[PDB]
Write a protein that binds this ligand. Structure first.
Ligand code: BCL
Ligand SMILES: CC[C@H]1c2cc3[nH]c4c(c3C)C(=O)[C@H](C(=O)OC)c4c3nc(cc4[nH]c(cc(n2)[C@@H]1C)c(C(C)=O)c4C)[C@@H](C)[C@@H]3CCC(=O)OC/C=C(\C)CCC[C@H](C)CCC[C@H](C)CCCC(C)C
Ligand SMILES: CC[C@H]1c2cc3[nH]c4c(c3C)C(=O)[C@H](C(=O)OC)c4c3nc(cc4[nH]c(cc(n2)[C@@H]1C)c(C(C)=O)c4C)[C@@H](C)[C@@H]3CCC(=O)OC/C=C(\C)CCC[C@H](C)CCC[C@H](C)CCCC(C)C
Ligand SMILES: COC1=C(OC)C(=O)C(C/C=C(\C)CC/C=C(\C)CC/C=C(\C)CC/C=C(/C)CC/C=C(\C)CC/C=C(\C)CC/C=C(\C)CC/C=C(\C)CC/C=C(\C)CCC=C(C)C)=C(C)C1=O
Ligand SMILES: CCCCCCCCCCCCCCCCCCCC(=O)O[C@H](COC(=O)CCCCCCCCCCCCCC)COP(=O)(O)OCCN
Ligand SMILES: COC(C)(C)C/C=C/C(C)=C/C=C/C(C)=C/C=C/C(C)=C/C=C/C=C(C)/C=C/C=C(\C)CC/C=C(\C)CCC=C(C)C
Ligand SMILES: COC(C)(C)C/C=C/C(C)=C/C=C/C(C)=C/C=C/C(C)=C/C=C/C=C(C)/C=C/C=C(\C)CC/C=C(\C)CCC=C(C)C
Ligand SMILES: COC(C)(C)C/C=C/C(C)=C/C=C/C(C)=C/C=C/C(C)=C/C=C/C=C(C)/C=C/C=C(\C)CC/C=C(\C)CCC=C(C)C
Ligand SMILES: COC(C)(C)C/C=C/C(C)=C/C=C/C(C)=C/C=C/C(C)=C/C=C/C=C(C)/C=C/C=C(\C)CC/C=C(\C)CCC=C(C)C
Ligand SMILES: COC(C)(C)C/C=C/C(C)=C/C=C/C(C)=C/C=C/C(C)=C/C=C\C=C(C)\C=C\C=C(/C)CC/C=C(\C)CCC=C(C)C
Ligand SMILES: CCCCCCCCCCCCO[C@@H]1O[C@H](CO)[C@@H](O[C@H]2O[C@H](CO)[C@@H](O)[C@H](O)[C@H]2O)[C@H](O)[C@H]1O
Ligand SMILES: CCCCCCCCCCCCO[C@@H]1O[C@H](CO)[C@@H](O[C@H]2O[C@H](CO)[C@@H](O)[C@H](O)[C@H]2O)[C@H](O)[C@H]1O
Ligand SMILES: CCCCCCCCCCCCO[C@@H]1O[C@H](CO)[C@@H](O[C@H]2O[C@H](CO)[C@@H](O)[C@H](O)[C@H]2O)[C@H](O)[C@H]1O
Ligand SMILES: [Fe+3]
Lengths: 43, 306, 281, 54, 248, 43, 54, 43, 54, 54, 43, 54, 54, 43
């Protein structure tokens, strides 16, 4: 499985940091989407 | 005189080379064909074997159907007269359906449906041939560079015949299957869209076509100029750099100020060649769908006086 | 600075003119007698193009143009503002190209290699002279040449191509286009094949000229060989340029009408000229 | 008509099966397209007319 | 037609053209870096690395695996001309020719330069010598053209230097690479065929004078030729165009 | 003969199952043809 | 027909699977395209006109 | 024996799973065709 | 007449069979299209006119 | 249909994951674009018209 | 068999993760389709 | 979802990260350009109209 | 969030730094030019009209 | 991991300097954005 040299243990923290970044990105995206939808909706 | 190494002055012939086999299925392989002395004055005089797999035979069958369909329609246009068929051969055309049919398949066979059938045949043939090139690279363990270089021209072809007609909403936009019919299609395409010269991607495509000619003149002349040091054996000059590679590098280092390597010049070559059809496909795709008058567009974007 | 292997080649000799007066390198560039000549001509041409820009009143790089003299001047001189700057820049460009080719000849001699490169460049130079010297003189006017602008020289191309109908029906044009297109195809195939052999599937051994011969025999049932492919590339490019200069040396000098009518001679062959049926029957 | 089986001893099964599949697919597509070409048999347009569709 | 502009005159075509400018800049960067795997870093004329190395950084190393256990070649990497380059700089400043100190045709410098390639034969895809003489090859014969065996060889001074004995051919290419030439002393020298003008009654050589064929490097084996020997032979033969010039 | 050299029993079973599939295909095609002709005959 | 399995012993399973996947995708998109082109079965315009949107 | 280097039992298992997939795909196709033909018949 | 077995002692059965199959298919499709060209033999046209489908 | 895990004994996860990511993204973009082309589904224009944004 | 180099257990767990992701994507797809259909049905 | 981290035993993290970055930037600029093209969502033009700037 | 520094264990810092520089510069130039295109936000023209320099 | 050949503390220090520079850049950006928004808001 470790085709990339990862040892299944630092992949856990790699995924944790990546999900932290992904969720911060999605939180800011949701804030922006809500602000625009209040500004003017599309549905 | 002084020999220039443009023709082989002595030919030598030996055992038929059946090629190597990394993961090749020997069963599909053909047997060596004849030997061409005339063609051997310029290169390898051996012909064959030819590999005929499953995508290969699919491509052969579909291409046979496409070419034969065009031929039968050409005979129909001739009145079945062989003399006319050999007189009006260039002027024949399997035209696409007229615009009032749009993208519909409900066109009469004599009125563009046959063009739809032949286009299906050629589509299948060319895509199976691309799969064929990829698989033949796969069997010998080689890189898939030829497959992607082919995909560039395949994309230009798909834009001309498939993607742009779909976007424009009519098969009438596509190129006919004729000799002068497709020349006329080209000239009329330029005239309708207002001087395709001012298409920036047509200009880029011409830049890379001129660059392909310039680059192959340069590379062929360079390799022939250092063929006296075994410059032809490019792979070994990559693995074990000789005086040929160094002299070729230094010629252009002292001429231009920069140079390639025996391996990276072929990266230059493949990219210079594939950018031709890449930019050409982009430019044809933008024509009509986005810009209908390229000279007015040019005026609005510099490129032309107001 | 030099490449890691350059020093053993930086030796005197091979210069056609001079021999030690202009036998040195500025950076990577080899400066010779012709290096000096080509630098002078190129610098003059660039400065004069910029000067013609300020005379034209534009600083848009894509709008700068340097037109040749009008048809009224024939094959004579012209004021700098009218067509004289174009004539001087044509002098400078011809000198720069020729000096570049001869400087390449000197570099070839110093490296002990063949002279294929300057010869192949002389082909391009003669195509350029066909467009700016041979065709205008055979026609009698410098105004039949093209302007030195990025998009105005395309205007020259379009107007000339439509002075004779659809230029696609010129047959020398047809063979030149076939050569250009097959040269691009050959370049794509050669680059791809060499890169595929030098770069295997993944983490496995480099391939051999036999392997690439095998690939192209398994693809199209043939291979031209590594010497043959470079021969073919040089031939395709040079012959494309040759038949380009050929299609534009017979156009407006031998044929004057719409080129499409040329293809009438074949359809009016007496045996099948008057058969009913077909496209032209 | 009781002896054809030995053709599988002169023909590679993979090759012949692929050839048959490709041939049948191409023929079926061609015939369906010809039927769509004829205005008397294009089922989409026939049902458009019979059901009074655009 | 989507001819709508997001801002100014910036339509979809403008987006396409600027995207291509960005992509072309990236591609030219990539292509230039892929071409800096030989001869780098740059060095001063005394062999030390130079102050300037160019705006393009060197690329990451890449490893080629030679087919027959010949080893893994990593490029870029450390480089050295592991041979006695015999030249003296004519000027203290950079950018001037280095004069040969001795006979350049023998020292292997200038147009006679050679590269210290691997001293091993060239192996085909079958693991055999790619090039071997006509006799060593099995079944190879002159299929067409002039047969240059037994023909006199005439140097650039118009004096015979020897006679052709055998042709060395390429196994996977079927190309005639080398001519074997015997001189007055009965020894054999190899000649690349790209330098010989095979006429009807003679095999002319414009590169070398008659009293230089013995100066051609020899071969440790009479049937196998290594890349080092091929490079030495070719460099010596091509050096005669500049150095054997004064003797017509 | 015997280019593949397949044992005669193997060729027998291969042909039998191939003809089973071919008969199945031809039967489905016959049914579809009858349906098409009944819906809208060409004769 | 209970013995159709052994065809897997003739053709490579990966070959068959990837080829049939490509074929399924191509056939599906082709049929969708034919239906989209015809006015009768172009569902977008059907929902535009029927719901009086156009 | 064969060409793909497989046995009959693994061939049976692969045929079973492929047939299950084929039946599921064809059944979803049948349901979709019924839904469309009820929505808008083509006969 | 009853001696044509000696052609296959020299010709390859595989090449002969594939070539003859391709030739027969090409001849058949050429003739079918020829008949479809002539309005006096276009069976789809004839059936359209007989049953008043246009 | 709960015993499909055997796919990974045939198809490399590396190939399928990247190929399907590209496939799904391209199809999603294509469908979104087709909807954007049809005036009945250009949601930007529907929202512009419904809320008097002209 | 095993051209992927994976044992049965690795394949089963990888399939379980992949089906978890596929069902998540399908559920989001159903939600988006339902919202679009109630907002502006295409049937 | 408790085993999604195995995606880093699937693909090279650098490749996934760079592909994600290019993908997301292209999507973001594409969406912003699409909004800027439509007059109802061009915030520059909207703010100009609200304040009577032009 | 705290252990974002781990980013420098995946990419070479020089590549990231040069990519960030060119990306930021191109984005900033693009946005400045977008604002210049719109007459609402062309500060040069706002200063021209506000102070009657035309 | 370990692709870049960096230790954890070197990465820590490099990220510390980078975050200092990033926050300085973003602070200048916020000040400029606020100034123009006061001068000419886009909402
Ligand atoms: C009056 C006409 C217009 C003009 C109208 C067009 C139109 C229309 C097009 C071009 C295109 C191009 N133009 Mg232009 N062009 C003009 C003037 C020029 C001039 C000039 C000096 O005046 C030049 C140098 C060019 C040059 C070019 C090329 C750079 C470019 C073609 C790329 C190519 O090689 O496709 C050739 C390769 C293919 C078409 C694909 C072929 C590959 C596929 C896979 C084929 C499969 C083969 C099949 C399986 C078997 C083959 C059959 C057998 C061999 C029998 N044009 C004038 C202004 N031009 C093309 C383009 O893309 O530019 C935007 C294009 O569509
Ligand atoms: C980078 C862009 C350039 C380019 C590149 C390019 N072209 C390519 C490739 C590449 C990288 C390939 O790999 C591919 C190839 O295979 O090259 C040899 C190809 C190719 N480019 C080709 C042509 C081509 N390329 C063109 C252009 C260009 N190609 C660009 C300039 C053009 C032009 C200018 O119009 C043409 C005409 C083909 C030679 C080949 C693709 C062949 C293919 O797909 O074949 C499919 C077959 C058919 C549709 C018809 C077959 C007709 C036969 C008569 C059928 C019957 C055969 C018979 C039964 C054989 C019997 C044999 C036995 C007796 C042994
Ligand atoms: C003959 C086959 C093809 C070919 C081959 C070829 N070209 C070559 C060579 C070869 C073998 C070289 O050795 C030589 C070289 O060094 O290549 C890098 C070269 C070269 N081909 C070049 C360009 C080039 N080749 C072209 C075409 C071709 N070259 C053919 C298709 C084209 C086209 C089609 O447009 C161009 C633009 C250069 C990169 C280089 C020669 C450089 C040179 O001439 O150096 C001296 C001059 C300068 C550095 C600048 C001179 C500037 C002038 C004094 C002023 C401008 C005058 C000009 C008329 C302006 C026109 C502008 C408008 C038309 C827009
Ligand atoms: C396998 O084999 C091979 C290789 O590899 C082994 C190769 O590689 C290549 C080569 C191929 C490539 C590298 C691929 C890329 C190539 C192309 C895409 C082809 C097109 C190339 C270009 C457009 C590149 C640029 C070309 C040109 C013509 C620019 C040349 C530059 C100049 C004009 C400078 C010329 C300088 C001269 C002559 C010196 C003059 C000196 C004096 C008068 C005195 C001193 C003057 C000064 C001090 C002035 C300042 C300094 C100077 C001279 C220069 C700097 C300053 C300037 C103002 C310019 C091939 C073919 C190959 O097959
Ligand atoms: C295929 C895609 C490309 C199609 C054609 C588009 C334009 C081609 C541009 C080619 C690359 C330009 C040169 C790159 C290398 C370079 O800058 O070389 C320097 C001299 O440049 C020069 O002399 C540049 C001249 C540019 C003229 C235009 C010396 O660089 P170096 O020798 O020190 O090597 C690098 C050490 N870092
Ligand atoms: C025409 O149709 C249009 C275009 C109009 C509409 C179509 C829209 C479409 C098709 C949209 C598709 C959208 C999709 C698929 C979006 C997917 C978005 C995703 C998955 C975004 C993920 C983002 C993840 C982020 C931003 C993660 C960031 C992580 C960091 C910033 C921290 C970096 C941490 C690292 C590298 C870990 C280091 C740790 C160790 C131990 C080394
Ligand atoms: C425009 O011009 C038109 C078309 C209008 C008029 C022109 C017409 C022309 C020129 C027509 C030409 C017609 C010709 C030359 C027709 C020739 C027809 C022949 C010779 C057909 C023969 C067909 C043979 C067949 C179909 C045999 C099939 C055999 C099998 C299916 C069994 C498979 C073989 C096995 C099992 C061999 C087993 C034995 C071993 C050892 C394995
Ligand atoms: C222009 O003409 C038109 C288009 C209008 C009309 C033409 C229509 C035509 C020509 C239609 C043709 C239709 C055909 C031939 C359809 C055939 C469809 C088939 C055969 C579909 C088969 C699907 C099979 C599936 C989806 C199988 C899935 C199997 C699995 C998911 C099991 C997974 C297990 C694997 C991959 C191997 C693991 C097993 C082991 C033991 C390791
Ligand atoms: C012209 O035709 C039009 C376009 C008009 C209409 C035609 C439409 C057609 C033909 C549509 C066809 C659509 C299809 C077939 C769509 C299929 C979509 C599928 C199958 C999507 C599957 C998605 C599955 C996903 C996204 C699964 C993701 C899984 C994860 C994210 C889990 C993470 C995986 C890990 C961690 C690997 C575990 C590894 C170990 C070692 C445990
Ligand atoms: C004696 O002669 C016989 C009868 C034996 C055979 C002779 C045949 C002859 C003389 C054939 C002549 C052929 C010629 C001159 C062909 C010329 C072809 C040319 C110049 C083509 C140029 C451009 C063609 C293009 C760009 C075609 C592009 C097609 C596509 C990209 C695929 C189109 C796919 C479509 C439209 C959709 C397909 C899908 C369905 C469902 C129909
Ligand atoms: C893979 C590509 C195939 C998928 C392509 C998806 C879009 C297909 C084109 C849109 C559907 C056709 O759109 C319809 O075309 C017909 C003419 O043919 C015309 O119908 C009136 C109108 O132009 C349009 O209502
Ligand atoms: C290199 C020398 C080229 C000489 O070519 C010639 O150059 C001069 C400028 O020197 C150009 O033009 C210039 O001189 C001509 C002729 O004396 C004057 O009429 C004109 O006022 C001036 O612009 C000519 O029209 C051109 O024919
Ligand atoms: C070249 C590589 C780097 C590209 C730059 C990096 C950012 C990429 C996207 C930038 C796109 C915007 O680029 C900018 O577009 C606007 C669109 O009106 C152009 O617009 C400007 O010139 C045009 C043409 O003369 C005028 O008609 C127009 O009134 C004026 O606004 C600018 O001349 C151009 O600089
Ligand atoms: Fe090469």
């Amino acid at each position: 499985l470790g085709y990339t040299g990862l040892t299944d243990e630092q992949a856990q923290e790699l995924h944790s940091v990546y999900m932290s970044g992904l969720w911060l990105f999605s939180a800011v995206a949701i804030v922006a989407h809500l602000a625009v939808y209040i500004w003017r909706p599309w549905f | 005189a002084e020999y220039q190494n443009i023709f082989t002055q002595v030919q030598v012939r030996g055992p038929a080379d059946l090629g190597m086999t990394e993961d090749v299925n020997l069963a599909n392989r053909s047997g060596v064909g004849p030997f061409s002395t005339l063609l051997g004055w310029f290169g390898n005089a051996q012909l064959g074997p030819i590999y005929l797999g499953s995508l290969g035979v699919l491509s052969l069958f579909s291409g046979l159907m496409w070419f034969f369909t065009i031929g039968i329609w050409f005979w129909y246009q001739a009145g079945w007269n062989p003399a006319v068929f050999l007189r009006d051969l260039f002027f024949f055309s399997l035209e696409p359906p007229a615009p009032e049919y749009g993208l519909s398949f409900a066109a009469p066979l004599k009125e563009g449906g046959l063009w739809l059938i032949a286009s299906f045949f050629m589509f299948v043939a060319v895509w199976s041939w691309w799969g064929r090139t990829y698989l033949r690279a796969q069997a010998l363990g080689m890189g898939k560079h030829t497959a992607w270089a082919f995909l560039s021209a395949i994309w230009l072809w798909m834009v001309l015949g498939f993607i742009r007609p779909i976007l424009m909403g009519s098969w009438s936009e596509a190129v006919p299957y004729g000799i002068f019919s497709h020349l006329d299609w080209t000239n009329n395409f330029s005239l309708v869209h207002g001087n395709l010269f001012y298409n920036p991607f047509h200009g880029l495509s011409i830049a890379f076509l001129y660059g392909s000619a310039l680059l192959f003149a340069m590379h062929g002349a360079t390799i022939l100029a250092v063929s006296r040091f075994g410059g032809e054996r490019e792979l070994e000059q990559i693995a074990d750099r000789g005086t040929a590679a160094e002299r070729a590098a230094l010629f252009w280092r002292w001429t231009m100020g920069f140079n390639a390597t025996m391996e990276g010049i072929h990266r230059w070559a493949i990219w210079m060649a594939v950018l031709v059809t890449l930019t050409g496909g982009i430019g044809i795709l933008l024509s009509g769908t986005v810009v209908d008058n390229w000279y007015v567009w040019g005026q609005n974007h510099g490129m032309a006086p107001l | 600075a030099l490449l890691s292997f350059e020093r053993k080649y930086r030796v005197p000799g091979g210069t056609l003119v001079g021999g030690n007066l202009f036998d040195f390198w500025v950076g990577p560039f080899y400066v010779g007698f012709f290096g000096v000549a080509t630098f002078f001509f190129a610098a003059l041409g660039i400065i004069l193009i910029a000067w013609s820009a300020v005379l034209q009143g534009t600083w848009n790089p894509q709008l700068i143009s340097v037109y040749p003299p009008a048809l009224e001047y024939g094959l004579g001189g012209a004021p700098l503002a009218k067509g004289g700057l174009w004539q001087i820049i044509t002098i400078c460009a011809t000198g720069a190209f020729v000096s570049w080719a001869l400087r390449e000849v000197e570099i070839c001699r110093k490296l002990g290699i063949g002279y294929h490169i300057p010869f192949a460049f002389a082909f391009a130079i003669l195509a350029y002279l066909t467009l700016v010297l041979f065709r205008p003189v055979m026609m009698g006017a410098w105004g039949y040449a093209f302007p030195y602008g990025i998009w105005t020289h395309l205007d020259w191309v379009s107007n000339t191509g439509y002075t004779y109908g659809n230029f696609h029906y010129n047959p020398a044009h047809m063979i030149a286009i076939t050569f250009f297109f097959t040269n691009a195809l050959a370049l794509a195939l050669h680059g791809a094949l060499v890169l595929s052999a030098a770069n295997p599937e993944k983490g496995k051994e480099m391939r051999t000229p036999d392997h690439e011969d095998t690939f192209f025999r398994d693809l199209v049932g043939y291979s031209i060989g590594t010497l043959g492919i470079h021969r073919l590339g040089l031939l395709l490019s040079l012959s494309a340029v040759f038949f380009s200069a050929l299609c534009m040396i017979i156009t407006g000098t031998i044929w004057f009408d719409q080129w499409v009518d040329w293809w009438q001679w074949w359809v009016k062959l007496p045996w099948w000229a008057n058969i009913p049926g077909g496209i032209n029957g | 008509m009781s002896k054809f089986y030995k053709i599988w001893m002169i023909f590679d099964p993979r090759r012949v099966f692929v050839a048959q599949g490709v041939f049948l697919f191409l023929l079926a597509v061609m015939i369906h397209l010809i039927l769509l070409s004829t205005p008397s048999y294009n089922w989409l347009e026939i049902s458009a007319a019979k059901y009074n569709r655009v | 037609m989507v001819g709508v502009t997001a801002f100014g005159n910036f339509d979809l075509a403008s987006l396409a053209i600027y995207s291509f400018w960005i992509f072309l800049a990236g591609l030219i960067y990539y292509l230039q870096t892929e071409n800096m795997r030989e001869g780098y870093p740059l060095e001063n004329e005394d062999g030390t690395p130079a102050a300037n190395q160019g705006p393009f950084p060197l690329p990451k190393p890449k490893t080629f695996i030679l087919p027959h256990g010949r080893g893994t070649l990593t490029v870029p990497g450390p480089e050295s001309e592991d041979r006695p380059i015999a030249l003296a700089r004519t000027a203290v400043s950079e950018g001037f020719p280095h004069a040969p100190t001795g006979d350049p045709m023998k020292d292997g410098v200038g147009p006679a330069s050679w590269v210290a390639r691997r001293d091993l034969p060239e192996l085909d895809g079958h693991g055999h010598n790619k090039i071997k003489p006509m006799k060593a090859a099995a079944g190879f014969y002159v299929s067409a053209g002039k047969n240059p065996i037994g023909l006199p060889v005439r140097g650039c001074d118009l004096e015979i230097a020897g006679k052709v004995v055998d042709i060395w051919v390429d196994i996977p290419e079927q190309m005639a690479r080398f001519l074997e030439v015997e001189l007055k002393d009965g020894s054999t020298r190899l000649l690349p065929m790209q330098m010989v003008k095979v006429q009807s009654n003679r095999v002319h050589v414009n590169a070398l004078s008659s009293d230089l064929f013995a100066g051609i490097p020899t071969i440790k084996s009479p049937t196998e030729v290594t890349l080092l020997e091929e490079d030495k032979i070719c460099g010596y033969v091509a050096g005669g165009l500049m150095y054997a010039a004064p003797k017509r």
